[PDB]
Amino acid sequence: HTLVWGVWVNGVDQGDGRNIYIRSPPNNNPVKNLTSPDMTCNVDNRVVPKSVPVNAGDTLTFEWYHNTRDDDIIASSHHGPIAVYIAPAASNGQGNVWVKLFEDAYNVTNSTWAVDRLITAHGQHSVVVPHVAPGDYLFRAEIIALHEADSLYSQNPIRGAQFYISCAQITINSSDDSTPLPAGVPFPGAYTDSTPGIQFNIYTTPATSYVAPPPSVWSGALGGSIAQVGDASLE
């Protein structure tokens, strides 16, 4: 149970974005139904009044929280991967449009899940903005908590993988469009019951065996990290 508070750009806090530049749901409940329209941008997908300006090569940081800003972030039990996708805003997230910019699942060296590292990062994880066409975009950050993912929601609706999905309105201003955006995947649609990483038992299968759900990260993506960029408590 977690939500996005806002974003930072190049280490500068853009301010509370909830219902402003983040298409925020009313609470931190998970989405579990893989075939639901809620998989696109969570349960209250609508245009919100602002879009955060960035240029290609900037670092865009999403900041999550549980109940209040810079708290426990997400329950430790919720081990699982983190991804970020991008789609042009004209799609409203429909169709075959979401392109993966970032994936982190399990880190063998550190013996930590992406979620574990997100808590240590005070909720903060980043992507470098790609050299796509200037315009308006949706950035879809997705945490998959696997603590009940040994079951499928479609079979047992009280269990299943949990998706914590947040879409940010981002306007890319300066970019040379040297890596135009490729074909993407649909949400809902990309994840199905048979997709690797949707059903998995974190308690008996080694975490070194986990494979996150495709798609693979686009070759044009400029990477990203799970790491604190700014101190919220210094506001």
Ligand X SMILES: OC[C@H]1O[C@@H](O[C@H]2[C@H](O)[C@H](O)[C@H](O[C@H]3[C@H](O)[C@@H](O)[C@H](O[C@H]4[C@H](O)[C@@H](O)[C@H](O[C@H]5[C@H](O)[C@H](O)[C@H](O[C@H]6[C@H](O)[C@@H](O)[C@H](O[C@H]7[C@H](O)[C@H](O)[C@H](O)O[C@@H]7CO)O[C@@H]6CO)O[C@@H]5CO)O[C@@H]4CO)O[C@@H]3CO)O[C@@H]2CO)[C@H](O)[C@@H](O)[C@@H]1O
Ligand Y SMILES: OC[C@H]1O[C@@H](O[C@H]2[C@H](O)[C@H](O)[C@H](O[C@H]3[C@H](O)[C@H](O)[C@H](O)O[C@@H]3CO)O[C@@H]2CO)[C@H](O)[C@@H](O)[C@@H]1O
Ligand Z SMILES: *[C@@H]1O[C@H](CO)[C@@H](O)[C@H](O)[C@H]1NC(C)=O
Asked if 204 interacts with ligand X (CB under 6 A), we say: yes
Asked if 63 interacts with ligand Y (CB under 6 A), we say: no
On whether 164 is known to bind a ligand per the annotation, the reply is: yes
- Other Cβ atoms closer than 10 A to 151: 15
136 binds, among ligand X, Cl ion, Cu ion, none (CB under 5 to 8 A by kind): Cl ion
On whether 78 is known to bind a ligand per the annotation, the reply is: yes
Residue 37, both tokens: 């329209």
Asked if 67 interacts with ligand X (CB under 6 A), we say: yes
The structure tokens 């494979």 sit at 211
Asked if 103 interacts with ligand Y (CB under 6 A), we say: no
203 binds, among ligand X, Cu ion, Cl ion, none (CB under 5 to 8 A by kind): ligand X
Size of site (CB under 6 A) for ligand Y = 10
Residue in 1, 18, 69, 147 binding Cu ion, rule: CB under 5 A:
1
Query: How far is Cα 109 from Cα 213, in angstroms, rounded to an integer?
Result: 21
For residue 178, CA distances in Å to 133, 134, 182 come to: 8, 11, 12
On whether 47 is known to bind a ligand per the annotation, the reply is: yes
Closer CB to ligand Z, 36 or 228, in the complex: 36
90 binds, among Cu ion, ligand X, Cl ion, none (CB under 5 to 8 A by kind): Cl ion
Amino acid at 57: G
Residue 26, both tokens: 């009313």
Cross-strand bridge partners of residue 145: 162
Asked whether the beta carbons of 74 and 117 are under 8 A apart, the reply is no
Report the binding-site residues for (1,4-beta-D-glucosyl)n. Answer: 9, 47-48, 58, 67, 129, 140
